[PDB]
Design a protein around this nucleic acid. Structure first.
Length: 118
RNA sequence: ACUUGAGUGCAGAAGAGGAGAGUGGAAUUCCACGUGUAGCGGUGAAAUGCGUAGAGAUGUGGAGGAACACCAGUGGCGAAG
């Protein structure tokens, strides 16, 4: 309701950040399965960055990936943040065979300067 | 008059020394379309701002500018900047 498609493969980006962290449980191509993140955790502001936000974000979004039912799907980290461990153990240690671990902190080789500090 | 000073020669070595042309990627923005929903964002805590006109994220492709990570180090070069 509507589309009940179920597939095995997929790589759901778990991109922790400074403020919050969204785990978009995407497809191997692909399309987004469960676009649920730490904002689905109703705690907003300071409590929306703790490691309980990691375990809760993987709880809801992993519940969605159980809704699509794909058994084997790895995870990846993007952006230097403070929830990566709860994303790892909550993601692969949510009860699946998630065993891929990449590093997608976009370290720009050249690039524009960031804002003044701070 | 003479040769170490200083210069020429001969052979080596080295460098982000300079000027002009061309090329290459990583990253950000923006745009087009797929996928998807209700948050994204920021903070000391929030709000302004963005988002159901479909955002964030994710996939693909295109345009453009600026700076070149790793080597890289109280390393090198320059009269100094």
């Amino acid at each position: 309701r509507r589309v009940k498609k179920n597939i095995e493969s997929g790589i759901a980006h778990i991109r922790s950040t400074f403020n919050n962290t969204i785990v978009t449980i995407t497809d191997t191509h692909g399309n987004a399965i469960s676009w649920s993140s730490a904002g689905a955790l109703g705690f907003r502001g300071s409590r929306k960055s703790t490691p309980f936000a990691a375990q809760m974000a993987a709880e809801t979004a992993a519940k969605g990936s159980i809704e699509h039912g794909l058994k084997t799907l790895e995870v990846t980290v993007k952006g230097p943040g403070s929830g990566r461990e709860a994303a790892i153990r909550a993601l692969q240690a949510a009860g699946l065979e998630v065993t891929a671990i990449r590093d997608v902190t976009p370290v720009p080789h050249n690039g524009c300067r960031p804002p003044k500090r701070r």
